[PDB]
Design a protein around this nucleic acid. Structure first.
Ligand SMILES: [Mg+2]
Ligand SMILES: [Mg+2]
Ligand SMILES: [Mg+2]
Ligand SMILES: [Mg+2]
Ligand SMILES: [Mg+2]
Ligand SMILES: [Mg+2]
Ligand SMILES: [Mg+2]
Ligand SMILES: [Mg+2]
Ligand SMILES: [Mg+2]
Ligand SMILES: [Mg+2]
Ligand SMILES: [Mg+2]
Ligand SMILES: [Mg+2]
Ligand SMILES: [Mg+2]
Ligand SMILES: [Mg+2]
Ligand SMILES: [Mg+2]
Ligand SMILES: [Mg+2]
Ligand SMILES: [Mg+2]
Ligand SMILES: [Mg+2]
Ligand SMILES: [Mg+2]
Ligand SMILES: [Mg+2]
Ligand SMILES: [Mg+2]
Ligand SMILES: [Mg+2]
Ligand SMILES: [Mg+2]
Ligand SMILES: [Mg+2]
Ligand SMILES: [Mg+2]
Ligand SMILES: [Mg+2]
Ligand SMILES: [Mg+2]
Ligand SMILES: [Mg+2]
Ligand SMILES: [Mg+2]
Ligand SMILES: [Mg+2]
Ligand SMILES: [Mg+2]
Ligand SMILES: [Mg+2]
Ligand SMILES: [Mg+2]
Ligand SMILES: [Mg+2]
Ligand SMILES: [Mg+2]
Ligand SMILES: [Mg+2]
Ligand SMILES: [Mg+2]
Ligand SMILES: [Mg+2]
Ligand SMILES: [Mg+2]
Ligand SMILES: [Mg+2]
Ligand SMILES: [Mg+2]
Ligand SMILES: [Mg+2]
Ligand SMILES: [Mg+2]
Ligand SMILES: [Mg+2]
Ligand SMILES: [Mg+2]
Ligand SMILES: [Mg+2]
Ligand SMILES: [Mg+2]
Ligand SMILES: [Mg+2]
Ligand SMILES: [Mg+2]
Ligand SMILES: [Mg+2]
Ligand SMILES: [Mg+2]
Ligand SMILES: [Mg+2]
Ligand SMILES: [Mg+2]
Ligand SMILES: [Mg+2]
Ligand SMILES: [Mg+2]
Ligand SMILES: [Mg+2]
Ligand SMILES: [Mg+2]
Ligand SMILES: [Mg+2]
Ligand SMILES: [Mg+2]
Ligand SMILES: [Mg+2]
Ligand SMILES: [Mg+2]
Ligand SMILES: [Mg+2]
Ligand SMILES: [Mg+2]
Ligand SMILES: [Mg+2]
Ligand SMILES: [Mg+2]
Ligand SMILES: [Mg+2]
Ligand SMILES: [Mg+2]
Ligand SMILES: [Mg+2]
Ligand SMILES: [Mg+2]
Ligand SMILES: [Mg+2]
Ligand SMILES: [Mg+2]
Ligand SMILES: [Mg+2]
Ligand SMILES: [Mg+2]
Ligand SMILES: [Mg+2]
Ligand SMILES: [Mg+2]
Ligand SMILES: [Mg+2]
Ligand SMILES: [Mg+2]
Ligand SMILES: [Mg+2]
Ligand SMILES: [Mg+2]
Ligand SMILES: [Mg+2]
Ligand SMILES: [Mg+2]
Ligand SMILES: [Mg+2]
Ligand SMILES: [Mg+2]
Ligand SMILES: [Mg+2]
Ligand SMILES: [Mg+2]
Ligand SMILES: [Mg+2]
Ligand SMILES: [Mg+2]
Ligand SMILES: [Mg+2]
Ligand SMILES: [Mg+2]
Ligand SMILES: [Mg+2]
Ligand SMILES: [Mg+2]
Ligand SMILES: [Mg+2]
Ligand SMILES: [Mg+2]
Ligand SMILES: [Mg+2]
Ligand SMILES: [Mg+2]
Ligand SMILES: [Mg+2]
Ligand SMILES: [Mg+2]
Ligand SMILES: [Mg+2]
Ligand SMILES: [Mg+2]
Ligand SMILES: [Mg+2]
Ligand SMILES: [Mg+2]
Ligand SMILES: [Mg+2]
Ligand SMILES: [Mg+2]
Ligand SMILES: [Mg+2]
Ligand SMILES: [Mg+2]
Ligand SMILES: [Mg+2]
Ligand SMILES: [Mg+2]
Ligand SMILES: [Mg+2]
Ligand SMILES: [Mg+2]
Ligand SMILES: [Mg+2]
Ligand SMILES: [Mg+2]
Ligand SMILES: [Mg+2]
Ligand SMILES: [Mg+2]
Ligand SMILES: [Mg+2]
Ligand SMILES: [Mg+2]
Ligand SMILES: [Mg+2]
Ligand SMILES: [Mg+2]
Ligand SMILES: [Mg+2]
Ligand SMILES: [Mg+2]
Ligand SMILES: [Mg+2]
Lengths: 134, 131
RNA sequence: UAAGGAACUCGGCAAAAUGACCCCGUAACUUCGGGAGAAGGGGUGCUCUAUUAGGGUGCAAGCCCGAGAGAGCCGCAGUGAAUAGGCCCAGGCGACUGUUUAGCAAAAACACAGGUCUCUGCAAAACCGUAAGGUGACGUAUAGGGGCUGACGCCUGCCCGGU
RNA sequence: UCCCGGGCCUUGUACACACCGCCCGUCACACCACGAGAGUUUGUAACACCCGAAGUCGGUAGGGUAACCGGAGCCAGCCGCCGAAGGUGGGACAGAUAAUUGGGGUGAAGUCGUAACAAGGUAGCCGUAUCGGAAGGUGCGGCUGGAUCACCUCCU
RNA sequence: GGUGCAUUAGCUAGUUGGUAGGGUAAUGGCCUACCAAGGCAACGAUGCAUAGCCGACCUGAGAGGGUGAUCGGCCACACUGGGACUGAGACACGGCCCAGACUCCUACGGGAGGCAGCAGUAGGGAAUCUUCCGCAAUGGACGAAAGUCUGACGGAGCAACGCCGCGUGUAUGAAGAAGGUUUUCGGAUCGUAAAGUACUGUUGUUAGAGAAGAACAAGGAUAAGAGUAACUGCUUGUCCCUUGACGGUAUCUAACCAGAAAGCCACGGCUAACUACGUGCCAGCAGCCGCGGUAAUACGUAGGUGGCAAGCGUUGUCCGGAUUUAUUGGGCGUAAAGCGCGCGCAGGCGGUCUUUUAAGUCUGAUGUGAAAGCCCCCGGCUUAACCGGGGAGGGUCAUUGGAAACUGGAAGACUGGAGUGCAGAAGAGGAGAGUGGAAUUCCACGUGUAGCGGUGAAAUGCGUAGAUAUGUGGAGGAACACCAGUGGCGAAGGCGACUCUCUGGUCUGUAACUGACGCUGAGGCGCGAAAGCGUGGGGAGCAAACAGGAUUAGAUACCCUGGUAGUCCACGCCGUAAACGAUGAGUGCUAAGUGUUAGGGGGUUUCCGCCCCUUAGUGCUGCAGCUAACGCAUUAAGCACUCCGCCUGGGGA
């Protein structure tokens, strides 16, 4: 536009949107109000463990969890690796990462950080899945 | 209406170059005299003459082309428009096309090219780029 | 009338409570007028400054009217007696003011402004009377009589076989 | 002339698994987010009155009192203004929650029809009004983002 | 000078100014009495939300974007509110008084407290350290001085948290040890890596030597000074003596040992690095494209390889790539994007010349922009990191001196813009009043007999109560046949029978007149097809809704027969359209060819007519140029300047 037009009202840029809303939120129990702080991991107790099927054309059975975070938000996570040991009423650590096949799953459960244990008989890429040196 | 007579001088030359016109004439003004006179100093235009009339006089410019019809002027640009005037300090005077072109500056010592301005440590309004 | 304060009862029926003047302040909703005295609060006595500051009247003498303030004084209490709105939230019905069963029912009933259908060309239709004579009307379809509905807002669907 | 299979040219296309294509809306089921909702419950900043500690200031001081000339001055006590917290009242704003409800989105296989894409079998679309299970139909005005069917006019 | 919201438009009453006084270190509504009604705001007041500010830090080619931890400067706070005393300085972190919440001691009367000081504890969290040693150095408070105090500060401890340095051995050694892993079974690869021989000690273990950081102060002798009647004493100079937490720390030399010291992620493409076996849309992988359905270089494990290395990967946040908010550096015919159109306040921009001024503009000097940090040049730690010395940069900064081209201000001058005058022309431009002829419908009367009407076929319907057809007359309403034409007029919507009245604009010629009087134009005010709404009329044709007949598997439709609102008029609303050239307004420049509307000039000719030139419109074809293409092309979507409007993936919407 013309310079005079561009002075009367300047250029406003677009605002990005975070893809992990629950990870970057806090809580204050004294005030019962969510505070705005960023955080790479959060922990919570899982309330339901199960599976659903991915979108087309995939056909597997993906093992998920339903975790209640420490700041009081109910989210859906995903267990990587072959086989786990999760049960209802278990404390786990979640971290960022979205899985494409699953519709609503937006977080990953880290393996080897808390009650959740590492994957059995992992020989390579062991830093992920939290399996110690054999 | 007419808001920038200097821009017309710049664009009339450009419009005549595309069709290889050998001359053009346009209403005269004091500031256009130096700009047209400057171009003759570096060979950008082959000649210039003044015609005296009632209203403001008239100036015609004779364009220049090389042997086998190559343009001598390959572009003209206006910098300090009426909507946004620009000014340059002594060290901010540019070099159009890495010294192969010229810039016309309206200093406090007169209208003179960029090369001459840096020899006198003066600034002013940058008027045109000719290359 | 101690303490309680609707526990009474079909139902706060009856009683209690508010009540004057001056100042501050005031919601939803609205047909923009209202609601509204919404709600909720504060001040009032007497003495001195004081025939005040200032007004009405008169030629002047004089007479009448009387805000703000300051300082004080006295009571449990100062419109010290009598007279003088209780208020708020939500729903049904009727738009409203009005009328009604003299002597059991005052209302959600009747009326109403507005809507619509229909009859009437003037010796009008309609009504009283056996008739004469009248009202309608000393009017004339923007007028007159009858039936239904009832401010205002949005609307008023299908059936003409039967009467 | 029609029915079937095929060959050339042209036209339109939202088709390319290539019309046995593509694709619209209601209805039944499941999930998710958002709005309304008789109400309920947390919190923020103020405002108007009532009451008002400490304290500085102002007035008295009949009680106490070494310096200075009984006097002065001083102090305790009492009184007045201002005043934090507290109480009462009507509003403003922000979040959560609530029987129920409204449209929206997602789900290969369910039911109904086939509105659009070819002249899509009534050309389509835009504004508006009315009607209908549903896509939608019809009236009025407008557009070509129409292949079309006939005389004339301009350009090559 | 440095932030978001207009889906936050009014705010304020000691508020705004004045007069007299009080109070303060000091001016001042800082406070009080009187007087007046002012003050702020679209250049964004007020309100809500968020936030300590800066030097600087990260990123970036730069312009910018994000941040304000550590170090330095300023500010505010000290459990939460309020108040004052003492003092040069406080409304006071380890001071006082009152009120509140909490913890503790009470003999029930009353009392005592504040780690956002250094350590440490519980809690919250994905997440952060020792309840250590010294005043030896530096700086503080007190003292005349030794000296006392100093969780400031010097050191030590824990944590791969980051940056820097180098150690996990060197050299020679096979057509090539064994063993893995594959093989069309010959071989290939791990691999010169083994093993062998020769060598080294950075690191390790042991034992010996052992720094700087120290200047001091005080105390003792002197010497010289100012001051002295004279000392004591004071100031400066030189000698003597004295002090280490770190710590026997750093650092040397003596010997023995290849011995105690390598992991992490990827190998389909992006992107450097591929083969076997297992599984069989299962297990599973994934940043995107997407891999897996009994021969997977993509899943799991091996062999091999590739990137780094005391690390390596994942997650979260910021900048870049992103020209994806485009000042540098984008756009709006068909992809998102020109308001439906006009009149215009504020604002933005503005023809030619002369004189002057110096606000903008350019330039010199002075003051300042602390230190640390980035950058440049030197020097110390065995190198580096790190630390010193000097410099540079960094401002729409303040005072002062110059220049006058450009923008601005002032004084004049001109006519190519704009407007008036004078002479002509064309037009369905608008409002009001009246009139005309075809045609449809209804009504009355002659003539006349059996059908008419309708469809792809039919039927409903009309007709013997005499229709359709035909001749005559009457009533009423709506639209204007031919002319009629990518013809005309208007800002757009739009305007077509005729006459008159009242009115707006445009074009051409002249050069008399004024002399820049102009363009665009957010808010504001008006106009604005059709449908629709209110009140009063009118109602011939047409016709949503509706009814009947057909078609169809069904047909709330297309087709047929009827038909109400509406369409028409007056007044008042509504404010939309594919309101379209899907193209904002103004101005100038840039090949031609040819129709047409309204004018002007010239030549031929008596006219007519033909030709040429020119102004303003309206169409077609085409060059340069532009475009993704289609296409536009003097009526631009080409080349330029000014102002306004709008856009930033789709759905939700
Ligand atoms: Mg992997
Ligand atoms: Mg009692
Ligand atoms: Mg009592
Ligand atoms: Mg009570
Ligand atoms: Mg009660
Ligand atoms: Mg009882
Ligand atoms: Mg009862
Ligand atoms: Mg009573
Ligand atoms: Mg008086
Ligand atoms: Mg009384
Ligand atoms: Mg009373
Ligand atoms: Mg009543
Ligand atoms: Mg009675
Ligand atoms: Mg009679
Ligand atoms: Mg009679
Ligand atoms: Mg009579
Ligand atoms: Mg009438
Ligand atoms: Mg009614
Ligand atoms: Mg009734
Ligand atoms: Mg009504
Ligand atoms: Mg009815
Ligand atoms: Mg009947
Ligand atoms: Mg009948
Ligand atoms: Mg052939
Ligand atoms: Mg396709
Ligand atoms: Mg169809
Ligand atoms: Mg219909
Ligand atoms: Mg139509
Ligand atoms: Mg089309
Ligand atoms: Mg400021
Ligand atoms: Mg004063
Ligand atoms: Mg003030
Ligand atoms: Mg503000
Ligand atoms: Mg960049
Ligand atoms: Mg920068
Ligand atoms: Mg800190
Ligand atoms: Mg605390
Ligand atoms: Mg003091
Ligand atoms: Mg305090
Ligand atoms: Mg202190
Ligand atoms: Mg302070
Ligand atoms: Mg302090
Ligand atoms: Mg403390
Ligand atoms: Mg206490
Ligand atoms: Mg601490
Ligand atoms: Mg802890
Ligand atoms: Mg914890
Ligand atoms: Mg010390
Ligand atoms: Mg010291
Ligand atoms: Mg001293
Ligand atoms: Mg001590
Ligand atoms: Mg210590
Ligand atoms: Mg320290
Ligand atoms: Mg370390
Ligand atoms: Mg680690
Ligand atoms: Mg082998
Ligand atoms: Mg072998
Ligand atoms: Mg050694
Ligand atoms: Mg030793
Ligand atoms: Mg030793
Ligand atoms: Mg010392
Ligand atoms: Mg000494
Ligand atoms: Mg001596
Ligand atoms: Mg001596
Ligand atoms: Mg000495
Ligand atoms: Mg030793
Ligand atoms: Mg040595
Ligand atoms: Mg050795
Ligand atoms: Mg590769
Ligand atoms: Mg396989
Ligand atoms: Mg891969
Ligand atoms: Mg693999
Ligand atoms: Mg391997
Ligand atoms: Mg390797
Ligand atoms: Mg390293
Ligand atoms: Mg890392
Ligand atoms: Mg990351
Ligand atoms: Mg950018
Ligand atoms: Mg773009
Ligand atoms: Mg444009
Ligand atoms: Mg489109
Ligand atoms: Mg578009
Ligand atoms: Mg337009
Ligand atoms: Mg202006
Ligand atoms: Mg100018
Ligand atoms: Mg100007
Ligand atoms: Mg500096
Ligand atoms: Mg060096
Ligand atoms: Mg340094
Ligand atoms: Mg330096
Ligand atoms: Mg000049
Ligand atoms: Mg001068
Ligand atoms: Mg003119
Ligand atoms: Mg006319
Ligand atoms: Mg007209
Ligand atoms: Mg006729
Ligand atoms: Mg048939
Ligand atoms: Mg007839
Ligand atoms: Mg026009
Ligand atoms: Mg006129
Ligand atoms: Mg006219
Ligand atoms: Mg015209
Ligand atoms: Mg003149
Ligand atoms: Mg205009
Ligand atoms: Mg406007
Ligand atoms: Mg209409
Ligand atoms: Mg009407
Ligand atoms: Mg009507
Ligand atoms: Mg039907
Ligand atoms: Mg009909
Ligand atoms: Mg009208
Ligand atoms: Mg709309
Ligand atoms: Mg529109
Ligand atoms: Mg149109
Ligand atoms: Mg448009
Ligand atoms: Mg233009
Ligand atoms: Mg143009
Ligand atoms: Mg033309
Ligand atoms: Mg989106
Ligand atoms: Mg969006």
């Amino acid at each position: 536009p013309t310079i005079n037009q561009l002075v009367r009202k300047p250029r406003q840029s677009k605002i990005k949107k975070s893809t992990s809303p629950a990870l970057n939120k806090g809580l204050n129990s004294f005030k019962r109000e969510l505070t705005d702080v960023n955080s790479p991991q959060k922990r919570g107790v899982c309330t339901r463990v199960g599976t659903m099927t991915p979108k087309k054309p995939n056909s597997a059975l993906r093992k998920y969890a339903r975790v209640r975070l420490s700041n009081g938000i109910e989210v859906t996570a995903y267990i990587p690796g072959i086989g786990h040991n999760l049960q209802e009423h278990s404390v786990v650590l979640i971290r960022g990462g979205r899985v494409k096949d699953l519709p609503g799953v937006r977080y990953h459960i880290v393996r080897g950080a808390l009650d959740t244990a590492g994957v059995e008989n992992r020989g390579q890429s062991r830093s992920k899945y939290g399996t110690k040196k054999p | 209406v007419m808001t920038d007579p200097i821009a017309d001088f710049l664009t009339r030359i450009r419009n005549a170059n595309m069709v290889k016109h050998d001359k053009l004439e346009l209403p005269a003004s004091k500031i256009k005299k130096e700009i047209a006179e400057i171009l003759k100093r570096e060979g950008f235009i082959r000649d210039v003459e003044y015609i005296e009339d009632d209203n403001a006089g008239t100036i015609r410019v004779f364009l220049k082309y090389g042997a086998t019809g190559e343009r001598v002027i390959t572009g003209l640009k206006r910098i300090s428009k009426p909507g946004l005037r620009v000014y340059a300090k002594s060290t901010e005077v540019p070099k159009v096309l890495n010294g192969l072109g010229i810039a016309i500056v309206s200093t406090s010592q007169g209208v003179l090219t960029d090369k001459e301005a840096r020899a006198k440590q003066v600034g002013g309004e940058v008027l045109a780029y000719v290359w």
